DNA sequence: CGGGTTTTTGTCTGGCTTCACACTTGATTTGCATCACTGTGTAAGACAGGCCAGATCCAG
């Protein structure tokens, strides 16, 4: 298959594609279930007045990552 | 320099396939250009200069 077909099929495996909900709502955690690669700094202030920032980071959301991991192991279970 | 004897083929002949060929338009799928960067360049040798040490020389 050409590259666009592969890229399109990739979206099924990445986190933020399957619906779910926690029965007790998670405190201080959003309920939206389509986030992908959240920024690592998490909205950290990067102006000139605050503490200087000299790092970069990328990461998924924890619950979405667990959901994707569990869905990747459906046939096994 | 050209006579015999099979190969190598396009047809004649007209009549049966299986694919070929006008139009759309709205998607859907491929194909290709573009952009900010990457690695491989990766240990020793030649030469001048300050510094004492000790040899080189001076004079009572």
Swiss-Prot record:
Tissue: Maturing lymphoid cells and central nervous system.
Cellular compartments annotated: Nucleus
Post-translational modification: Autoubiquitinated in the presence of CDC34/UBCH3.
Consequence of gene loss (knockout): Mice display a severe combined immunodeficiency phenotype. The have a small lymphoid organs that do not contain mature B and T-lymphocytes. The arrest of B- and T-cell differentiation occurs at an early stage and correlates with the inability to perform V(D)J recombination. The frequency of homologous immunoglobulin pairing is much lower. No obvious neuroanatomical or behavioral abnormalities have been observed.
Coiled coil: none
Function text: Catalytic component of the RAG complex, a multiprotein complex that mediates the DNA cleavage phase during V(D)J recombination. V(D)J recombination assembles a diverse repertoire of immunoglobulin and T-cell receptor genes in developing B and T-lymphocytes through rearrangement of different V (variable), in some cases D (diversity), and J (joining) gene segments. In the RAG complex, RAG1 mediates the DNA-binding to the conserved recombination signal sequences (RSS) and catalyzes the DNA cleavage activities by introducing a double-strand break between the RSS and the adjacent coding segment.
Family: Belongs to the RAG1 family.
Domains (record comment): The RING-type zinc finger mediates the E3 ubiquitin-protein ligase activity.
Quaternary structure and interacting proteins, as annotated: Homodimer. Component of the RAG complex composed of core components RAG1 and RAG2, and associated component HMGB1 or HMGB2. Interacts with DCAF1, leading to recruitment of the CUL4A-RBX1-DDB1-DCAF1/VPRBP complex to ubiquitinate proteins and limit error-prone repair during V(D)J recombination.
UniProt name for this protein: V(D)J recombination-activating protein 1
């Amino acid at each position: 298959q050409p590259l666009h077909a592969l890229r399109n099929a990739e979206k099924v495996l990445l986190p933020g594609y399957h619906p779910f909900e926690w029965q007790p709502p998670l405190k201080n955690v959003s309920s939206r279930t389509d986030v992908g690669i959240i920024d690592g700094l998490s909205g950290l202030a990067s102006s000139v007045d605050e503490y200087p920032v000299d790092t970069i980071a990328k990461r998924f959301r924890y619950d979405s990552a667990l959901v994707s991991a569990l869905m990747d192991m459906e046939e096994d279970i």
